[PDB]
Design a protein around this ligand. Structure first.
Ligand SMILES: [Ca+2]
Ligand SMILES: [Ca+2]
Length: 312
């Protein structure tokens, strides 16, 4: 398995548990700091990073009824410059660029308590697919499915429904949607961290998946495994292999990595492409920093890069 060593450039640092790198519609860059604490209690932050200077600005410190959040993953919205944020303590949040936020739901479509979320991914139809490795959201005691299999997967539909699509995962983490050339959602890819497995489902429609299958295998015996992921324009899946010092690259068909990217740090956590470029921004937990490197090609367009009123 070939391994490349691209040049990594430091962007900024000192961001506890650096995660969820994302770009909004205007090209602004954001990341979350889920491990920031205050007196032993969660006080995670959402930050905007000035790429020119690397200077940080906390735009939001989510808290609901005295319960601080643990924001971990983000997705940019198309129909408005707002961010959807997976929070391990608060569930799903919608955050405005001015710092105002709102909790999306405390219960799913079946009326059961919402679980803490980790990452999310929009399909081109506007449906948001979410991984939920934590137990019930605040005020319930914080728990995570690292050992027990109670992690779930949700789909937040365009018509505002929060539907659990599956469960029994041992820490579902990264998640990505594979689209057909016609732009139709084809497959859902879900990372299950400790098991070193990538799972796939066939997407038949909103909140409708079937044919669960082991899609890929993550290398290493190390503690950890697949964390965040994203597709490049050719549908190659880049996966942060937390604890391995590498970012695995899978071909459209899955299986074993077609190649690996060696990182100058042991714990890559998540990644994201800068729109219209080959630039990938990577968050990592060794130094709690954000880095960037050049990929061999542009990233797959994110949902908020698509046009609602586009002819072609
Ligand atoms: Ca994650
Ligand atoms: Ca990403």
């Amino acid at each position: 398995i070939p391994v490349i060593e691209p040049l990594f450039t430091k962007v900024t640092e000192d961001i506890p548990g650096a995660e969820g790198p994302v770009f909004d519609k205007n090209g602004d860059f954001y990341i979350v700091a889920p491990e920031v604490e205050v007196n032993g209690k969660p006080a995670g932050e959402i930050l905007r990073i000035d790429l020119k200077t690397g200077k940080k600005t906390v735009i939001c410190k989510p808290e609901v009824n005295g319960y601080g959040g643990i924001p971990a993953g983000c997705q940019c919205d198309r129909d408005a410059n707002q961010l959807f944020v997976a929070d391990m303590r608060l569930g799903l949040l919608v955050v405005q660029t001015d710092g105002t936020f709102e909790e999306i739901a405390k219960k799913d479509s079946e009326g059961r308590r919402m679980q803490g979320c980790d990452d999310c991914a929009f399909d081109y139809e506007g449906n948001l697919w979410i991984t939920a490795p934590a137990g019930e959201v605040a005020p319930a005691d914080y728990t995570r499915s690292m050992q027990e299999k109670f992690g779930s997967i949700y789909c937040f539909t365009t018509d505002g429904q929060m539907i659990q699509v599956d469960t029994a995962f041992q820490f579902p983490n990264g998640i990505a949607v594979r689209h057909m050339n016609d732009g139709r959602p084809y497959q859902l890819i879900v990372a299950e961290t400790p098991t070193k497995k990538l799972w796939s489902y066939d997407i038949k429609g909103p909140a409708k998946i079937e044919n669960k299958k082991v899609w890929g295998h993550i290398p290493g015996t190390h503690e950890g495994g697949a964390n965040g992921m994203d597709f490049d324009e050719d549908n190659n899946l880049l996966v942060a292999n937390w604890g391995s010092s590498h970012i695995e690259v899978f071909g459209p068909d899955g299986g074993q990595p077609k190649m690996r990217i060696r990182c100058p740090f042991e714990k890559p956590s998540n990644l994201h492409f800068k729109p219209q470029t080959k630039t990938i921004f990577v968050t990592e937990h060794e130094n709690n920093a954000v880095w960037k490197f050049e990929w061999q090609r542009n990233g797959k367009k994110q949902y908020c890069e698509t046009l609602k009123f586009g002819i072609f």
